[PDB]
Every structure is written in structure tokens, then in C-alpha cells.
Assembly symmetry: D3
């Protein structure tokens, strides 16, 4: 019984955008403030059972100098400068083990896996704490409503800033070819990557699968699945805070970043996805301002194109970087 | 379709207790450190539509001087010194509105309603933030696993301390009869009250309904409901952290507090409660070291005795304070 | 999933009304027949633990002299004549205990709580039996299909008559200010109150929250929740009886009463309510012929505005009666 | 998902019986009172599309002369006196159409199908009303709690009396061999048959499949399915009425009837049945005082043996009657 | 919360049909190839407990001379040549016991019950195997995707051919009136019957209830129920095979057969049916090229009209055959 | 709210084994019959985007010469002879793409991935057909009851033979170190691997995670999840076939193979696993006749140890092979 707009409508779907007059200023100032702290990227080579890949334990300074973990996986190859995928992680995930991230290396790409602050407890473990802007306001369980009463205190202000800085950290690794740095993610990872496509000066291509954190007002109207339902549940209780909540969310909405993003991108969507509804994904894709393609999977839910989509991504990047 | 131990077994159920050798020292030090900050209780009389009750907006210093909101409701009665109920709130709730707490005042008791730090977003709104001990470690969405890797950082260290200090703040109000201060709650509120029944020197009676935060190791093995499932889900991912997690929780387990509590108590239990299973409630009741009674509701789930139990509580206190 | 018409369409939703030519005559004759039995209101003061409120055990004659229970709660105040709220109860509920109805008394209103015939066994206990018009026809479990093959035998004929008579009983209490009698309820209580707003000559204001018993034909096509599903399930079996069922229901449909009601009203609606869908609520609101306001809660289900709405009601009445 | 006692324990399961001292007196007086009214059986031959069977529209006097509907289906055969099955119907069922009951006629048996007072609205239509003992007390939706506060007013007193009288009515039809009258049913129908097996002097054999209305106290503890859950839901609300409820139910419990029943019986049971749990079925079977067999279906739920069981019944009766 | 197009749209719903240019050639060749094998119908009279009906154990040659089981039930009547219903069976069913099919015989019709190859394990037993066209390709569990990458290997090619030949077998029985041979089924049985109404030269009337195997592309878009979901799940995995899957299904789509069928038909449809959605049933009914009626059940799910529809079918055939 | 035996009982759980006298003879003959067809292993190097791994498209002869697909992935390393993992696949999966199997190659092992006959349509695509032993008997949807009425026709006879032959095919590849061939799988893959540990003379160690196809009689009594429920559903219908079904299954039960298996093994088990209940896994582990260890994950469901367990396997094999 799930259904969004028909495909012909989805392809033309361009809802009115809402953002505050200071959207750009907010992000400029946020990034400037964090850039005042040295990146201090650390890549510690590890003793590992992996044989085809060199694994490094990563640390770097993200939001306000806060130290973020990651992995760096380098495939053992003759080529001196290698292309690079900066990988962002889905909701309730974390960096896990180096072996959880063998795809891109196996395809000949260095992979920088960014750990997600405060999460890492749902489906894959993580090692990086969050650090709040002082008091942690009343919230619904999870990360979606953490600090939501003000953009400056909002959880994803910190995540997005870490994500922008992760690309700088990857770029600092000597074996990375800076002309071929890719930002990638699915769901939460895709919404992060979308922000980064607008904010980073270093990223050269975007892989954005079944993106989360897009078109919040519609998402919350359409589905009662988690994690978007964290927001709805907040609003069910804090009935006086509707305007404020959506004002805050406007600064983090992937649709508003997409409108600013200029790098080439490959999107994916599942037309039966009731976690990240197709209309939210198409809103972002349709506003995306760089060269772009989308793979559409009519019969898939939130798994999207799965391993088929991974192949499409390899082919897409090969072609782009020739 | 849910079933725990048979009632005859429940009434004898006395599982081996597990606590660390420094349980008492941990709490002594915690309370002493927070007592270095002045209580600074504030009772601001409000403009209210309420006619039978005077409503006050409360502020007091809880954990490490952190400012905690509440309500004080005083029934308009001839009697100069009135008995007092300190009310703690269930999971995902908050102090809401003064009119949400009209029972005890209508029964002739001053009511001090403690707002719950960081919550107030699920079923009733709240106004009080949490403040973490530095970094907010990776966690499962919610409050159950917030800081769980160390008792000093654990969420309920802060809440329990707030709750002890709430009794002090209530006692400071001039119309409160200090010989008749009651601590009360259901589920999370009951878990909090149980802690307070061991840690407070001011409380004179305990009302403990369908208590949560009891017998964690058993809870997690019996039910897959929330909020106990937050802990299970954390353990599913952080497979290396089992011993630490349960070590931490031993400092907050209502069964360990029950063993230390000396004041008279009225407990309630629902034999079909699959949020707070009867074996966890009985383990706390059975170890409870003060004079005690329990009302048993054989066909009820987590709603327990509802309004029938409210009557029992009114009768229990009337007799006790005679 | 759940979504009704968009808000802008809800606000203009005025479906074609269906009623029989004898609607008014049916109700005139029903009321006249019951008025031939004396009201014989009895208010027995009770021994109570309540301190701020005087409680009375109520009996009064409703449908065809049948004796209906209730509570009268009188707040202890200086004022001689007090305003009064006649409170109707949700489905499967009953008058419970006096202490279940402290809100309005606390706000300075006498509260007359009407027990619901034959129900009182789902979420709050009741003490009043139903009396059928002779044989109790085949029915689906519950009260929705009880006597549904004829308006004269239909369950809500008896309830609505009781409810009209409850206002008269409340008005007969000496401390009640007859210029300030309010009729109030949510869901079933809201549907009852809406009928009473049309049929009573004594009621001065209506509070109608998330009303049930409105726009039955649409309700049954939109949702499969209880209690509306009792009707669907009856029609699934009695496939020959569709026209008769909807003809019967037409006499009891809150939309048809709304069109006749002239007193001032405050409605509420939850846009995600799948027990009483927004389109059924708006159909009644939009046809409501008295001076009217509605509070709209976009993210709420059947809980509606909860405690926020209770505040809106106190403010609405104060302004209305000043 | 569901499991009752192991089969080896079920075979030995003989729980302590509870009944009042006046069990037999209550039923003697009940039957005597209803026998003061003339049976007045009516068998109206119908215009029917059926070719192999003669269909009759039946009326007879059941509880206190109340007129109960039925079907009589007579297979067109040479034999002058035919054996007869009196068929009782499952919960929320009714007599439906004559073609709904072609099994037994096809097997050469006259079939008397008894309509069920007040039901007939869930899965098959019915035509027979209920007639309460005056006021219809507060109840949970359905038939299980109708009049449950007193055995004199309890719904199944009426149904069981109709059912005893149905056998009388069948026996009055001239083509019926009175030496070969069988009483049959499944679930509610089985619970009714079991009562009739103890109370009727005309029945010659019992078919009792997956019987309902057995061992209530256990049923309610074991499963949360309907219809047993109507009782649990009533007890969750009316918390003061537990002793009275089970006192009443004791007069209608199939286990108490089984202990008095002397005619030959074939039972069936599904070991995965969570509507009528095996332990309640076995408690009845085990106390059953006549010659008895049971067919055990280890992998079946409430469907039991289905068409396999029907064959077992035909074989069992053939052997019994030859 | 299930709904298809509104009824007034359903009645006009005529979606664009898709079929390959060799649809007729495919079926002509398929039938001709199976007709090269002798029908070799066997009717073995059985020892049976049935008294009003003669039962025969049936064997006949279906797809490529493969031996299919069945039952023949002949009502014991004076008339020499009787009318005949060829009955096809629902998904996961089989021919069961002769006593499972007493309706039509009781109504004066010989009944030929066709067993379903490879099924017979879900709700009623079966005795007939399937015989694949060589290798059994990767498939989702069930019969819907068995051989779906090629019409020649597809499961329903074999079933439909069995079904055409079952009419021939029935016609070969000497007591069968060949002017009054009816083909009938519900759900899968209805989809089979609809194919046979196009492909058989012997059938004289169609009873088609809540037909399955219709308008596959829409079905899969609308509902996530089984068995249509078998297809969706296959497509979720085999993301490269969408075009081939629906090309294959086009040769077996009840809508494409309906457009070729010329015999008189009675359809039924449940407007809340979420197994066989109304729009798929109406697409088939609307394209049906013979004389036709539809019974519409607005409140029923996949049960459709149940026993009310059976009565309509008897009346329909009586009128047509006079 | 699921639970199997307590861990201390699980560790001692050794249920009575049931097998037929000809268990060994059945497998000797099965293997000898298939060995009469040449293995004819084909390894075709592929054009691939993979850089750290060489991919081969595999074909080999399994059951009765039937041609099975696979992948061989060889990591690019200096070492001449490499250790090898033969990987079997979970239920409804297939060989998918080479990039789906990067773990073991990345750890320095050649990986031979066996495609699963007739599956490949649920979560990962497959390319290998099944070939039945003639007719495909009536079955419940899926593979668990395919040919279950006879061990000779049973689906897993074919799968387990394929799997024994897959090890021979891997051993035939020149770079494979035959002293370091590992057999591996989870769930269905684990059940297959367990059979192979008993039947293959070439395997050197077993990795067996959360094994399926174990202790069938118990599994079916404990859980109603798929795929074990396919058997239960079959038995619900074919009520006369219980003894036959379990006799057939005894030949394929992982507990019976475990008793014969002599190679070193690492098992894993999730104590909350309700697909493969812990009692079935422990019954196999406890009868396992080779040197053995088990990793126990107390809080995990069917995911077991996930990436943690992968690490344990790499460490286990390194230690074993020194």
C-alpha cells in the first residue's frame, strides 16, 4: 500500500523551496569558525589481517576542532596517485571495522570512511563522541531532534562540518589524486554528501543514493517510519514549536544544498522507498544544479539498486574521469 | 501471550544481587559534590486560570548546580502546614502544564512536579535540558544508553541526583509539612523514586508503581519492548561492551536501592506488564528493606491499577500519617 | 501512511448532506416521549477523600425514564452561582471515579459527568445499564451496530436522549449558573455533545474535540480502525442491509445536527487522526451553524491537542462568558 | 510464537475443578422454567434451488419461550427414518443460508442448524435476536461479558437453554430417527455442544471440535486472542469484579459439563491453537465422563483437522451407530 | 486504509492493453501440441460415505499429456443429462476430498473439480505434480515466478492448458449435458477460468469471482500482498529482467483473454479486496467481450460476496439456461 | 519476548538423534552416482572493474552432472599457492556479482562462491537452475518441501551433492593450496557446509554460522518464522504425511552430519535468533565430532556476531593453519 507521486509527476516535481535569507552566511561563518582549528590529520598504519589493502586508523579535526575518527583503506597498486572515495555512513551506523568497507579499494579507489559523531550503536559500531553546544535541550530519542530549536545548536551542523573537513583530511593523504575525490553515501550518508557537494571546494563528484535529510516538511507528512518520525513525534508534543523546528531544518535540507551544488552527480531512488520517499529524493535531484543522472528502481524499497547500483557507480566514475 | 514467573514464585523471587564494592561511596561522593552548589530554590507564583490551587513555577539546582524546572501546586485550604507529594515523571515525559497534575492537590496534598532533564518530547512536554559530562559517547537513540560506558557519565546519575535535590527543594517551601513528604512515581518515575527512597534523608513514604530501572539483566532477557530494548540494541552492536554496560547499570538498579531503603512503601504491579515485567518489579519489592505493601493487578499490563491504585495510595497515606 | 484531504480542501469540504424528511419529527417525538417521565434528578453528597471539591453521586431519568448515573463535582469556592460543564465520555468508557474528572472543577466550573449506558468496560469503569427496545437484533460486537436496522431501536437514540436530559439535570442543581452551561466531549463524547447542541434548549456553549459519529459513509470508506469498523464488519456480512444501515445512521450523524446547532462552539481536529478522520470532523465543523472556531493540530493523531487544547478551551470560555 | 503444555502433560492434565454447590440446581431450575413454555416447533418447507435436499425454515421456543431460528435440511433418500445432526455455530456466526450446511445431508443425515441469538454479524449472517434479563449491564463489546456479573443474567444461560431445546425441536420432526441424534460443533459450537451433552436427555452422541468456553481461568492467563480477551479486557477495567466474574463463568464452563456428560464423544484439538488453547481443550476432554476419543492435530492452529476431521466424524458415527 | 479508484472511475476503467503480436499464435501452438496426446479421461467410481452424490476419481491428460487429477461429483437425480460446472481452485489449494465440493451437486449440477499441478499444500491438499520444461530457473518461492523468463516455460502455460483440457474431459462424461457446461472459479480459479473462456470451444458460461492473474503491472504497483508480491520480490532482485518479466506475463493476463472471450459471464468484485484489487478486476470485466454482469460488494475484501454470491450464481445460470 | 533453553542447558543439550539405518548408504550411493559424471570444472577469466582481485566465471558438474555456476575470486598476491574458502549462500540468495564476495580475497584467501540451484531471487540474484527428479510433487511455496515425500527426490539431496562437488572444483584450480581448503556459510550456507564437513574428503576446516537445516522436529515446534514455517505449513495441510516428512528430513539434518564430521570447526550462535533457534544450533554443535569452538552472542538475533564474527574466523583460521 505505499505509493508516492506517479513517476511522470516525480520527474517534474519542483516544490517551492523555503530557506532563510542568511542560509549562506550561516554556513560561511560555521565553516570559518571550524577552520580556525588546525585540521591535524592523523593516518596511523595498522597491523591488519587484510592483505590486498593498507589500513590506516584516521583522526582529524571536524566541527570546532573536535576529533573525528575514520578509516583509510588504500588498495595495494602500482599507480602512485589513486582516486578517492569519501564515504559517509547511514543512520545509527559508525565506522565499524576496516573490512566493512572493501568495495571501493577493490575497485582501485582509496576509501576514506568517516565515523559519525554520537551514533555507532544501531547496526555498525562507532568510536566518535558528539559534543553539544552547551545544554542538551529536551528532545525525542535519537539524533534528528538534537538541538533542533536553533540551527547553531543543531546536531547536523556538527556532522556536516565534520563531513566537509573529512574531504580536506582525505586530500591531505599523499597517495590521493586530488582531481579524483568522490563524496559518497546512502540515506543519511547521502544527505551528508549532498551538503558537502554544496559546501566543499575539494569534492569532484557526488554519489547520492536514496538520500535522507531532504524536503523535511513533505517527508513528515508522507511517512511514519523512522528516522523522520522522530521529528513528527517531537512536534506531536511541542505543539508550540512547529515554525521554529522547520526554520531550523531549512538550513540542513538537502534540497537547498542541491540548488547550490555544481559538481557532477549520480543519484539513485527506490520508488517503493518509505524511509526516504521518492518525492523527497526527486525534489533534491530536480533542484540539483550540477551535471546529473539518476538511476530509478521502480520495485525497490530503501535498499534501492543494491549491488546493481554499485556497478552503475563504478561505470559512472570511470566515464567521468576519462 | 506474555507471561513471567507464576505469582507464587514471584512472591519468593530473590535473585542474587550484583553491585560493585564502591556502590555507596559512588553515591556519597556524587551527592556531596552536588551539595557544594547552593540549592537556590525558586517558587514564582503564576497567573493561572486554576481556581482551587495556587500554581508556582519552580527552579532548583540539581546535579552539579544544573537548574531544573518543576511545578508546585498548592491546594487552597485552611490547614497551614500541608502534606507533600514529590512527583517524578515517566519516560519521554516532562512537567507539561500545571493542570496535568491536579490529583494530589485535589486530595489535600501540595504537589511538587519534577521536570525530567533532556526528555519532555514524547507524551508530555518538558522544559529542562540535560548537560553531559563532556563528550556524548556513541549511543542508541534515547536516554537508557546515554553515557553507559561509565557510571560517572551515565544519564541517570544526573536524574537521580536532581531527584534527591527535588525533595530538598520541596521541603524548603514554607507551607510544606516536613513530616509528611511523599516521593512518588510510575515506571521511570517509580525507578527514580526508588533511588530517592535510598538516597534521600528527607522523604517519609514511597509510592512506587510498575517500576522501571529494575533488575536490568533479567529485563533485557525477558522483553523486547522499549525502553529496555535500547540497552539490548546497544549490546547487539557493541558486542565487546557487555561486562562494562552491566557494571555501569548495577549503580542505578532499583533492586540495589530497595535493599537500602527504610521508609514505608506502597508498590503496584501488573502481572501482564511487558514494559516492566513482574519479575523485575518483584525483585525490587522483595529486597525492599522498609515496611511495605504491594497491590497486585493480575490482568493488567503497564497501566497497572490505574484509578483503583490511586485510591489505594490515598488510603495508604491517610493510615500511615495517622 | 495515513492522509486525508489536504488542509486547504478540508477547510472548504462541504459534502452533500443526506437525511430523511422526518429527521426533526423523529427527534421531537423522541424527546417528547421521554419528557413524559419525570427527570427526578437526585444528587447524593458523598463521603470522599477529595478536599477542594464536593462530590455527588447523581441519578436522573434519561431515555424513557431509564435511570442514568453520573458524578457532580463542585469546586469549593466563594462564588454562589458557578458555571458548569456537562461532560460526555469516550467509547468504552464510563463515569469511573469522581477523581477522574478534576480538570473543570479546578478551573472553577461545576462538572456534571454523564455515565454512558451499557459501556464502562474498556478504559474506565461504568455503572449504568442499557435497556433495549425489546429484542436485541443480530449485531457486530459493540455499540455501533446495536439496533441499527431501525432508528427507533438504535443505541444512540437512547444515549443522545440521556445526554439532552443530563443538561436538564445539571441545570436543576441550585449552584449552577444557567447562563453558563457548557456541553463538552471528545470522540464519542464530541459526537454526543454535537447532537445535544442541536437538541438541547439549555446548553450555552459547545466544546467538541475530534468528534466521532460524523459523516459515517465517508468514515467507513476511509479507515478500518475501531469503532467505525464495527459498521463495516456488519455490512461485510449483512450485504442486503446497506441502504437500511445508512438510512438509520443519517438520524444520528453529527453533520446533520451541526447544521441545526446555533450555540457558540470550539472544535479541535488532529490531521493525522485515523480514528476520527479529518474530513469527517471538518464536514461537521463546516456545516456547524453557530458561531465557531476550530483548533487544528497538523501532526497529532486522535490525542488531538491534548493539554494544549484544554488551555484553549478555558481561554475560549472565559472570553465567551465575559 | 505459541506453545502450551507438552503433549505428554496435556494427556494427563486434570486441573482442579471449581464450581458452586448449586451448579446442578441452577441448571435444573433454568431448564424447568423454559419448559413451562410450549416448544411450538415450526418447520416451513421452502422454495429452494437445492435439488438433493429438502430445506425447512425453522422456528422453536428456546430460553423462556423466546423464538429461535434455524434450518432443517433433509437429504432426499429412500430411508424413512434418518439419523440427525444438530449443528451449533461458531462465534459471530449465524444460520446463514441453507446451502452453507450441505455436509451432513450429503452424508445421509438430517441436519438441524441452530441460529445463534444476538450474533450473526461477523462471518455468516443470522436472524435471531437476544432478549436480555432486563437491564443490559456495562460490558466489553461482544457476548462473552454480556450479563457476566450474575449467572441468571449471563448470555450463555440463554444460548445453552436454546441449544437443549433445539435437540427437542429436531426430535419432533417425523423423519428423525431419535436413536441417532448427534450434537455437533466447533469452537463456540463445541462449547455449546458440550453443555448440551450434559443437559439434554435426547442427544445420542457428541462431536466436539476445538472447543471454546472451557477452563476460563486458564484460557485468560494463556492467550490474548479474541474472543477470550473480551473477558480479560473487562477484568482490566472492573478490577473489583474478578471473584464474581469467575464465579459466574463456573456455571458455563465446558470442563464442568464434561464431568457430567455420559454419551459417546469424538473430540479434536489443534496443538498450535491459540484461540482455544490445547490445555483448555484437554481439561474438558480429560474430565469427559462418557466413552470418548480425541483426534490430535499437532501442527494445526484453530482450523484443527479441517476436512480430515470431517471424515473422522463420519467414520466414528457409522461405527457407533452400527 | 486500503482504497483503489472510486467506483465511478472503476466502471469506466479501460487501461491500454499490452500484448505481443504472437499472443494468439502462442496459444494456438500450445493447444495443438497438447492435443497430439490423447485425452484418455478416466472416471473411477469410488467407495464413498456420500449418499446424495456419486463420486468419481478423475484422471486426464493436460499439458503435453501430463496426467492431471480431479473429482467428478454427480448428484443422484432422475434427469438423464445434467448441467455441469468445471471448478478451478485457488492459490495453494488442490482437489482435497470429494466432500469439499458439495455445493454445485446439491444445486443439481455435475461438478468436475480440477486439481492444480504442483500446488495443494497451503489450505487444501492436492495430488497432482508439476512437470517443468527442463531446468527450473531461479525463482522466488511459489508458482508466480516459476519459468517467468520465457512464456514457453512459464508455469501458467501448463495450468491453463490443463484447464482447457479439463472441460474436454468433463464433456466426455456421458451424463454431462454439453449445452450446459459452466467454467467457474475464484481468485486463481477465476483467472484460470477467464483464460479458458477465451481458449475453450466447449464452455458455455463463465463464473468469475474476485479474479487473480489480471492486469499484472498495475497489481504489483498497488498491493504488497501475496501472491502478487512474489513477482515484485523477484523484480526487486532481478533488476535487469523487468521488461522480460512483463512480456512473459502479457501472454497470461486475464485482461487479454477477456477481450477475446465471447460466452456469457457473471463476475464478482470486492471493493476492499487488497489481494485482487478492484481496478485489476474491473480492467478484466470492462474488456470482457461476451454478455456480462458484475456483482459489486463495496465493503468486502477478498471474500467477495461469499454465500450471497453463490445464490446469485445459481439464479444467473437458471435464467441463462431457460 | 522470544527465548529458547537457558544457556547452561543449551551447553548440555544433546537430544536423542533420529536417523534411518541406511543414512550412510543413501549418501554413499548418491555421491557415487554423481561421481560417474565428469566434474569438468571451467574457470573463465573475466573482464572486470576489480583491481585487487582476479575474477573467474565458474561452471562445474554437481548433482548427476548438472551444471552449477559460481565465482572464483583470486586476490593478486606474490604467494603461489593460496588458502581457499568455499562459500555457500543463504536462503533465497545466489552468486550475485563477484564484488559481493570481497571479504575472503581481501584476507588473502581464494574464494569459491557456489551458486544455489533454483533460488537466487530473494535478496541476491542467481543464475543456476534446479532439475527435479521427474514430477514436482505438490509442495508449499519455496525449497524446504520440494520433493519432501522421498529423500531421493528431496531438493537438498541435490544442493548438498553440488556442494560436495564444489570443493572438488575449487581443489582443481592450480593456485589453491589443498591443505588449506575451508568450507563456510551462514544459515542455509551453514547447514550446507555442515553436510559437506561430513561428506567431503577434501575440506580441511569448517566455519558454520547460525546454521539452518538442523534439528527439524524441534525447529518447527519452536518458531513460526520462515523458512522453517514452510514445513509446518505443509504439515498443516498434508495431515497424513507427518511421519514421512520427518523421515525424509532425517537424511538432511545437520545434527546427523555433525555426528560424522571430523574436521576442525568454528561455530557461532545468536541467543535471540528466532530463524535458527539456539537449541537447534547447539544440538548440532554439541554432536559435532571434530575439534570445535563456538562463539556465543547473547543479545543478537539471526545477524549473530556480524563483523565481530568475521574477525574471529580470520583469527581462528590463522591459528589453525600455523
Amino acid at each position: 500500500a505505499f505509493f508516492d507521486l506517479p513517476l511522470e509527476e516525480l520527474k517534474k516535481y519542483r516544490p517551492e523551496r523555503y530557506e532563510e535569507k542568511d542560509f549562506d552566511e550561516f554556513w560561511e561563518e560555521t565553516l570559518a569558525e571550524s577552520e580556525k582549528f588546525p585540521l591535524d590529520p592523523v593516518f596511523e598504519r595498522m597491523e591488519s589481517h587484510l592483505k590486498t589493502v593498507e589500513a590506516y586508523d584516521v583522526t582529524f579535526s571536524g566541527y570546532r576542532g573536535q576529533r573525528i575518527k575514520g578509516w583509510l583503506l588504500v588498495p595495494k597498486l602500482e599507480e602512485e596517485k589513486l582516486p578517492c572515495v569519501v564515504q559517509y555512513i547511514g543512520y545509527n551506523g559508525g565506522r565499524g571495522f576496516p573490512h566493512d568497507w572493501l568495495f571501493w579499494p577493490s575497485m582501485g579507489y582509496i576509501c576514506f570512511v568517516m565515523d559519525t559523531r554520537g551514533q555507532g550503536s544501531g547496526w555498525l559500531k562507532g568510536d566518535t563522541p558528539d559534543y553539544p553546544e552547551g545544554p542538551v535541550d529536551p528532545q525525542y530519542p535519537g539524533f534528528m531532534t538534537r538541538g533542533i530549536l536553533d540551527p547553531r545548536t543543531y546536531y547536523y551542523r556538527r556532522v556536516f562540518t565534520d563531513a566537509v573537513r573529512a574531504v580536506e583530511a582525505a586530500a591531505s593523504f599523499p597517495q590521493v589524486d586530488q582531481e579524483r575525490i568522490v563524496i559518497a553515501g546512502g540515506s543519511q550518508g547521502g544527505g551528508i554528501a549532498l551538503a558537502v557537494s554544496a559546501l566543499s571546494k575539494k569534492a569532484k563528484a557526488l554519489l547520492c543514493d536514496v538520500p535522507f535529510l531532504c524536503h523535511f516538511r513533505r517527508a513528515v507528512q508522507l511517512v511514519d517510519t523512522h528516522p523522520y518520525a522522530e521529528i513528527t513525534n517531537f512536534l506531536k508534543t511541542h505543539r508550540d514549536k512547529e515554525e521554529i523546528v522547520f526554520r531550523t531544518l531549512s538550513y540542513f535540507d538537502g534540497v537547498n544544498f542541491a540548488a547550490r551544488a555544481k559538481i557532477p552527480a549520480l543519484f539513485s531512488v527506490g520508488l517503493m522507498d518509505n524511509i526516504c520517499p521518492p518525492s523527497t529524493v526527486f525534489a533534491a535531484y530536480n533542484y540539483y544544479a550540477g551535471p546529473k543522472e539518476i538511476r530509478i528502481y521502480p520495485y525497490n524499497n530503501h535498499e534501492g539498486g543494491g549491488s546493481f547500483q554499485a556497478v552503475e557507480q563504478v561505470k559512472f566514475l570511470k566515464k567521468l574521469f576519462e
